[model samples]
Target: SSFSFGGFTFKRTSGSSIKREEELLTGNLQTLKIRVHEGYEEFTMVGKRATAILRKATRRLVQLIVSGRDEQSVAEAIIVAMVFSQEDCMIKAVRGDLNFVNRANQRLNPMHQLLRHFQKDAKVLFQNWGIEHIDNVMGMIGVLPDMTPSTEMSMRGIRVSKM
Candidate 1:
């Protein structure tokens, strides 16, 4: 799938390119076998920008959630998902095994705070979003595979889990 948005053309590649890149890396290649072309690079850059905006919006939502503001949390989650889906199209267009693990690890503090805040009122927040089928707000963040807390410290070393 290819899309032209804001004067940039984005091309989607098959997942094979990532596998090929990994193979080349394992063989100790001096240059990358599959280079992300200019158009795809532009698309990825735009996607990164979109991710930044979502992060900021999610942070604000977390503040509201922590303050016992349930309504705002639902509104913000819907907005975040809407924006994420749009930006994720660009991400799929770039078409490589783009790893968000390292990036998300760096943002662990904010992510943890967001999850903890939302978990405090998960039922009401999900209800407001009209998503009675789902059980956890953390799943919405798309970080389960690479999720890790920023610190291992526990309250009095008893492993006080976040709510």
Candidate 2:
């Protein structure tokens, strides 16, 4: 079976092998193949654009997940799925696939509920991809500064005293 959201479609080529599910649960993921239509080369792998984009996307998702913001995480996941629709882009994992599979199971997950409720909002956002909308999505990629005490102290007092 296949799944579609935003502008992207996910097709699982292989059947449910026990090994694959185990791999995913253990933090391993398949190399997701993102198939796009025409004009896939615009975001070519050159200069590591694909690498950088996916990196930023994953970081944003992780930030939301760790912050315990499931609402924001769902929104970010939708945006990430939309962005992944670009040609020649691939990642080891995706929130979409994870949440989608979770919904099909008999278990109860907060993320699955959020994914179900966020459907209308996801489609609304997906409808518009103009400059304004593009900016909002692209803005998701930015510096995720480390906020630890050691990192903070080193950047403050040491620099101020030297000056």
Candidate 3:
């Protein structure tokens, strides 16, 4: 496979052209992956170019398990999933992963990304603990055989969307 930029054609190698993130859930934690980009040169082992492999993966699990109650707070069950997390929404905000302006001067941490896709009452939805989900989180790198977090990826290339 090849991607074009400027006037150059970047051909993919024999193996996978990019990293494939697969969201998986087991035991009590949810995990995500970032297949390396075909053209990324810098080492991304330290974490950057952020998106919620973690948030999206955890979302898969949360949607499956967060049972509904009440008309206004149906999504509040995200709080249940969030009650066990602690990733500092402020960090993500500063990092540009999320853009929360009214963080109440405290870290939203757990439900930072979640609420972005939703909101207060039924709209709000919720992620993370440093030590808590690390194993499952990092386990993603091992399971996704030929991928890296710093790769160019798209749902269109990775998997077929039903829509």
lDDT of 1 at 111: 23
Ranking by TM-score: 2, 3, 1
User: Pick by lDDT: which candidate is best?
Assistant: 2
Tens digit of per-residue lDDT, candidate 3, span 89-125:
3122122233344456653433343343234322111
The lDDT of each candidate is 0.24, 0.26, 0.24
| TM-scores of all predicted structures | 0.17, 0.21, 0.21
Q: Report the C-alpha displacement of residue 155, candidate 1, in angstroms.
A: 34
TM-score of model 1 (CA atoms): 0.17
Q: By summed lDDT, which 10 consecutive residues of candidate 1 come out lowest?
A: 59-68
Write out the backbone clash pairs for model 1: none
Candidate 1 structure quality by residue, lDDT tens digits, 1-163? 4653322233433211121121122112222233222111111212222211111121021111111123343333333332222222212222222222334475233223223333333333232322112222432221111122123211110111113
Candidate 3 at 16: error in angstroms?
30
